[PDB]
Design a protein around this ligand. Structure first.
Ligand code: SRM
Ligand code: SF4
Ligand SMILES: O=N[O-]
Ligand SMILES: [Cl-]
Ligand SMILES: [Cl-]
Ligand SMILES: [K+]
Length: 538
């Protein structure tokens, strides 16, 4: 790699970070959008106030404002559903470590309730909330309402640092390695500039996913993050070994690799900043399919990239990885659904199944009520799109289990439902090839009617090759496609994936059988379960 390749390609100008004049040749259309107008200005200079007053039909008549609503608004966590729910916006939060309060949950419910049949909410595969139905004129008030209840939606889409994932059992599991909440909280504060916006990290070449590990179970999926902090003691000091570059895309899926770096626990934010600065400064900005950070690591080599991180650290110090980390490889991933004792004597948590992560306003209010009556007003989200209510006095569990709402959001659903994960799909998502959430529930129910099993088989349904529902981590994955029935008629289908493993012995699954009509999946899946996962026909 020539020295010229290492010249930073962006510069700070008037509070924002912009591509230098000599580094604009050959850039992709998204990079052009960012040059034409700085997206962060919609929040930080309150550009949203006037934009929100323009009728959407008028907005669509000019490129600048159309790009404002379809692209730039994703820096404020607002996602126009142009194709599938025209004029409505999904809104996505920052929710480090998946932690919400009952007051926040009620606020979110109040927002979606206004929109009737156009509103609902979802738990995401980054243990985050999305709300739906939002209309542009309401955006300024919703931004204010979120701030009032201690939430932000900043920098949650597009070329930004995505939700910091942690251990859903942080602070409460007798078996945790280290409480991840202080670290994911710090990361979210850093990323969003304490909810004011942080332009230094909002002009990346592409999205970037961080997680902090605190569980032997590896609930945080460090192998598929751009930056994963693996807890490790080095020379008698507590800190983290760093994995970099994990990502999924249509073109390529890659597991994170060691940076060969250990940082003291107090250097979590400094090293996040250094890595982001290197990626921002040096990453390719052409073909969008080659802009994730791993492509930079391959271009420079991991050592070349490491040197760029090192030079951006305070005092330019970046130790080599600890020979060992704290994660025990002898481990069986633990079910968190149901009632479990906490490390605090006399307290339990309860994991509740949320079918395909989908809730309505009334459901959110009920869950918030349970959290107040039984817990400490806290609701935790998981990356399997379920919930945990922590801090419940154990003597209250008997009463809790009789609550009517637990017949719907169950502490002990059938085993295949426990492991079922599904993305948005074509109900709302414009890129989706198939419907996912309703279909996946239907198929899973039919499969479980036919077979019993004891292995915790994890089934993931994703609507297109973007693989937001991570089919490559599944025991059985389903990637949406269009295919043909016996008569040559167009039908919805799935490419079926096998081989995904999670935890310490992780492995990326691969296509097993392409183009299976969705109406033909049940027998295929039943047989796979009997033949490979010990399932028994009923
Ligand atoms: C909601 C969520 C799936 C879910 O049902 O849980 C989701 C939904 C969308 N993803 Fe995703 N992604 C979700 C997690 C992911 C993950 C999984 C993860 O983070 O572990 C991946 C694969 C891992 C990765 O990125 O490395 C993922 C890879 C994509 C990609 C492909 C990335 C790439 O490099 O090519 C796109 C398209 C893009 O960004 O260019 C994308 C694009 C989208 C958009 C924003 C596209 C769009 O605007 O319509 C989807 C919004 C649909 C909607 O209305 O909900 N989504 N997406 C997840 C929100 C996470 C969050 O709270 O921030
Ligand atoms: S995998 Fe495809 S269909 Fe599913 S939410 Fe992501 S972009 Fe939409
Ligand atoms: O929002 N999925 O990158
Ligand atoms: Cl996006
Ligand atoms: Cl769309
Ligand atoms: K779920």
């Amino acid at each position: 790699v020539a020295a010229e390749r290492l010249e930073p390609r962006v510069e700070e100008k008037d509070g924002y970070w912009i591509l230098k004049e000599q580094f604009r040749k050959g850039i992709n259309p998204q990079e052009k959008v960012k040059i034409e107008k700085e997206p962060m200005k919609l929040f930080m200079e309150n550009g949203i106030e006037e934009l929100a007053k323009i009728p959407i039909e008028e907005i669509d008549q000019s490129k600048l404002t159309k790009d404002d609503i379809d692209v730039r608004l994703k820096w404020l966590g607002l996602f126009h559903r142009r194709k599938n729910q025209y004029g409505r916006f999904m809104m996505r939060l920052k929710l480090p470590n998946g932690v919400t309060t009952s007051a926040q949950t009620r606020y979110l419910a109040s927002v979606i309730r206004k929109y009737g049949k156009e509103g609902c909410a979802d738990i995401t595969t980054r243990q985050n909330w999305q709300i739906r139905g939002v209309v542009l004129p309401d955006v300024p008030e919703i931004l204010k309402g979120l701030a009032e209840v201690g939430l932000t939606s900043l920098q949650s889409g597009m070329d930004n640092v995505r939700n910091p994932v942690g251990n859903p059992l942080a602070g409460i599991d007798p078996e945790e390695i280290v409480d991840t909440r202080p670290y994911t909280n710090l990361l979210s504060q850093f990323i969003t500039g304490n909810s004011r916006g942080n332009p230094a990290v909002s002009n990346l070449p592409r999205k970037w996913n961080p997680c902090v590990v605190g569980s032997h179970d590896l609930y945080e999926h460090p192998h598929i993050n751009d930056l994963a902090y693996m807890p490790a003691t080095k020379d008698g000091r507590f800190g983290f070994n760093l994995l970099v570059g994990g990502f999924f895309s249509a073109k390529r899926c890659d597991e994170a690799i060691p940076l060969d770096a250990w940082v003291p626990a107090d250097d979590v934010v400094p090293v996040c900043r250094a890595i982001l600065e290197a990626f921002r400064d040096l990453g390719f900005r052409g073909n969008r399919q080659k802009c994730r950070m791993m492509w930079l690591i391959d271009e420079l080599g991991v050592e070349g990239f490491r040197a760029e991180v090192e030079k951006r650290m305070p005092q330019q110090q970046l130790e080599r990885a600890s020979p060992e980390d704290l994660v025990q490889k002898q481990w069986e991933r633990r079910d968190y659904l149901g009632v479990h004792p906490q490390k605090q004597e006399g307290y339990s948590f309860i994991g509740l199944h949320i079918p395909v992560g989908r809730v309505q306003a009334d459901d959110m209010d009920e869950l918030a009520r349970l959290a107040d009556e039984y817990g400490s007003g806290e609701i935790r989200l998981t990356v399997e799109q379920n919930i945990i209510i922590p801090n419940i006095e154990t003597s209250k569990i008997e009463a809790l289990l009789k609550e009517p709402v637990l017949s719907t959001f169950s502490p002990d659903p059938p085993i295949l439902m426990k492991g079922l994960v599904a993305c948005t799909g074509n109900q709302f998502c414009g890129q989706a090839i198939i419907e996912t959430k309703a279909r996946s529930l239907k198929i899973t129910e039919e499969v479980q009617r036919q077979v019993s099993l004891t292995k915790p088989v994890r089934m993931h349904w994703t609507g297109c090759p973007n693989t937001c529902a991570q089919v490559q981590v599944a025991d059985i994955g389903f990637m949406g496609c269009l295919t043909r029935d016996k008569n040559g008629k167009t039908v919805e289908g799935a490419d079926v994936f096998l081989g995904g493993r999670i935890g310490s012995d992780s492995h990326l699954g691969e296509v097993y059988k392409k183009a299976v009509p969705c109406d033909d999946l049940v027998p295929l899946v039943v047989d796979l379960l009997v033949n490979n996962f010990g399932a028994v026909p009923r």
